[PDB]
């Protein structure tokens, strides 16, 4: 799997983007299906915004969460992720 991370306005700690590593390694169903995963971070004075775009095979996954907290965010989009992955094994 491959994974681009852009912080648009912000600077991606490393803490931030091992905990965003991992977490996306461990996401299902149809994980091995993703060929790219590129996410982009940035904040709107208290949002701390996290948006995914996933590319499988036929079709593309857009997810975007927020909350105060970063690492809050990023668990949040999983769920998200998780959610749209269970659709497309669904289909």
């Known amino acids: 799997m491959h994974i681009q991370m852009t912080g648009q306005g912000v600077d991606i700690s490393p803490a931030l983007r091992e905990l965003t590593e991992k977490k996306l390694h461990r996401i299902q169903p149809c ?10 971070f940035h904040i709107n004075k208290l949002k701390k915004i996290v948006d ?8 593309t996954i857009n ?13 949040l989009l999983m769920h998200k992720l998780e959610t749209q992955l269970s659709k497309y094994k669904a289909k």
């Open 31 to 40: 994980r091995d299906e993703i060929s790219n995963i590129h996410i982009i």
């Open 52 to 59: 995914a775009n996933v590319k499988l095979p036929g079709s």
């Open 63 to 75: 997810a975007q969460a927020e909350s105060d907290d970063m690492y809050k965010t990023v668990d």
